């Protein structure tokens, strides 16, 4: 009897209909001449990797896999689905059935067939597969990542790895817009050199391979001219640039106005509409144009319930078919409650797109953002149909947060941030998952102390125990059971971090090594802090002064190190104990 393994995203409808079976060492593959070319390739790679040959001639003693779209006429597929259908599902949806030695995948479309294979890939462990009936489809139609942060852009290998990762987690969107790419912004008029164009072609190809919509962004708002011959020429620079990417296979475009001095709302929107008509519509196979206005968070967009000048004019002018993005109530913010999306969706008379600034850390680079999607309302799909996160300049560790973004945007109403966070680490880290949880748990909250605040609080259960300890002490209750419990946690933090330093692969380790060192330091300082509490209780001056110096030494190291972690928990505990 075989269990349903960790899946991501959570499929909408899944039932276990049997004990499971082992897939034979050779399979009958059926329907692959007509089935989506990218789905079949994904399936082929997986089979090759897990040592499963494909039969050349049908063999009834071996597992049979049937794959295809609704719109392929393949009856042997409908037979194996057994009354289950993908016909009535939304675009990108699929049906999957494994029972009695047969696996059937039917996509609503090709995107759907590819995603069906991704779920198949997740269900198989050591050749064993549960027997299940699945119908599955996304809540949000556009799901993915906007590479739009400041600082060192992702590398070519970073992006290729990310794209394979998106496909595997059913994220279908990747927006290329790095602030510090000179040709994206600072020098938006200039053509990419030939070798950079070759790297582009590679990313486009890989995107198509993984069903990801590569969105080419451009940010001309610094110095674009709007009127007369200059406006013509500048407009034609957008066309030329977008054309050269179209000609390599790009079918999505974004034009961004964020973080600029010029606030000509009407002219911004006019550029959009013109590009929408002379480019997006003319081409006819190009997806809806994406944008961000110069006012892009509720605070900057709205004043006493009514839109500000720029926003009101921009909403009035911008074409209805154009996707408009906003960051929520602030630039980096705790929540997007339903009522915020309702307000903004109302001003724009449309479904909105989110540019969610988590896990991005360009505003506070000492900390890793390693928590789940948090504070985003689970009914958000009522006003939002396009969801993307802005990641860190650290591609590898961004995967933890993105994993949870895949789940939240695919199956929104079922989303449980703690379960999704745990699953992300479990799926990504393997043997090291438990220890990574211990570390990452202290690194989920982003707070620059002023305008930027978001994410699940740092290790809340520990903070609760710490708070509880100060209560037991100031009301002189017997604290000794909690003190042993707490020595264990501090020991554990140190044990786990030492294990990660020793065993994490380079690709993860070179992103978090300074923060590991930081949490070990703080754990050691928490330990001395308890020694301080215990020695004060035991009226032992020798032990108290010795522990105190050690506690201050650890805090001094953390205060002056670039790495920042557990500010309000592991760090604060030491500060609290020195009073």
């Amino acid at each position: 009897q075989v269990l349903v393994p960790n899946l991501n995203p959570t499929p909408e409808n899944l039932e276990v209909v049997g004990d499971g079976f082992k897939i034979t060492s050779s399979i009958n593959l059926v329907g692959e001449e007509e089935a989506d070319e990218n789905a079949v390739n994904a399936l082929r790679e997986f089979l090759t990797a897990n040592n499963i040959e494909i039969n050349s001639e049908n063999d009834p003693n071996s597992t049979t896999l049937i794959i295809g779209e609704v719109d392929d006429d393949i009856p042997e597929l409908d037979e194996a689905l057994n009354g289950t259908t993908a016909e009535n599902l939304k675009e990108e949806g699929y049906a999957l059935v494994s029972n009695d030695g047969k696996i059937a995948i039917e996509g609503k479309d090709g995107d759907g067939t590819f995603y069906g294979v991704q779920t198949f890939k997740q269900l198989v462990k050591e050749s064993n597969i549960p027997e299940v009936n699945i119908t599955d489809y996304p809540t949000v139609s556009a799901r993915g990542i906007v590479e739009g942060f400041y600082g060192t852009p992702w590398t070519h290998q970073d992006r290729l790895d990310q794209i394979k990762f998106y496909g595997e987690n059913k994220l279908n969107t990747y927006i290329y817009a790095p602030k510090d790419d000179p040709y994206h912004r600072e020098k938006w008029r200039e053509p990419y050199p030939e070798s950079e164009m070759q790297r582009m072609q590679e990313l486009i190809n890989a995107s198509a391979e993984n069903k990801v919509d590569f969105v080419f962004g451009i940010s001309p708002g610094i110095d674009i001219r709007f009127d007369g011959d200059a406006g013509e020429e500048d407009f034609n620079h957008l066309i030329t640039k977008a054309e050269s990417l179209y000609d390599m296979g790009v079918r999505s475009f974004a034009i961004y106005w964020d973080n600029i001095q010029d606030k000509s709302a009407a002219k911004h929107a006019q550029v959009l509409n013109r590009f929408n008509e002379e480019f997006v519509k003319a081409k006819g196979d190009v997806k809806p144009l994406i944008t961000v206005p110069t006012e892009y968070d509720t605070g900057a967009m709205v004043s006493n319930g009514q839109p500000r000048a720029y926003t009101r004019i921009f909403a009035e002018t911008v074409d209805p078919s154009i996707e408009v993005m906003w960051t929520g109530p602030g630039v980096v913010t705790n929540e997007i409650p339903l009522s915020d999306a309702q307000l903004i969706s109302g001003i724009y008379d449309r479904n909105m797109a989110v540019w969610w600034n988590y896990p991005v850390t360009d505003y506070f680079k000492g900390k890793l953002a390693l928590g789940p999607m948090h504070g985003l309302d689970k009914g958000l799909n009522q006003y939002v149909d396009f969801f993307t996160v802005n990641p860190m300049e650290h591609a590898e560790l961004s995967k933890i947060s993105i994993h949870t973004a895949a789940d939240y945007s695919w199956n929104m109403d079922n989303y449980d941030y703690d379960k999704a966070w745990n699953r992300a680490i479990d799926m990504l880290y393997g043997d090291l998952a438990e220890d990574m949880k211990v570390f990452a748990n202290h690194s989920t909250r982003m707070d620059n102390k002023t305008w930027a605040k978001s994410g699940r609080e740092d290790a809340p259960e520990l903070r609760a125990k710490m708070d509880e300890l100060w209560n037991k002490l100031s009301s002189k209750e017997d604290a000794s059971a909690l003190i042993e419990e707490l020595y264990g946690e501090f020991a554990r933090m140190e044990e786990a971090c030492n294990n990660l330093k020793a065993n994490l692969p380079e690709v993860a380790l070179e992103e978090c090594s300074r923060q590991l060192d930081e949490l070990i330091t703080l754990a050691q300082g928490d330990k001395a802090s308890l020694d301080m509490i215990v020695a004060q209780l035991n009226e032992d001056t020798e032990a108290y002064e010795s522990a105190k110096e050690i506690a201050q030494n650890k805090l001094n190291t953390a205060l002056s190190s670039f790495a920042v972690i557990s500010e309000k928990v592991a760090q604060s505990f030491i500060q609290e104990a020195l009073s």
């Binding site: 400041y150 600082g151 964020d258 630039v331 600034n357 360009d362 505003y363 002023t450 305008w451 930027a452």
Partner: peptide, 6 residues
């Protein structure tokens, strides 16, 4: 230059 906002 290095990040958004203030």
């Amino acid at each position: 230059v290095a990040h958004s906002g203030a």
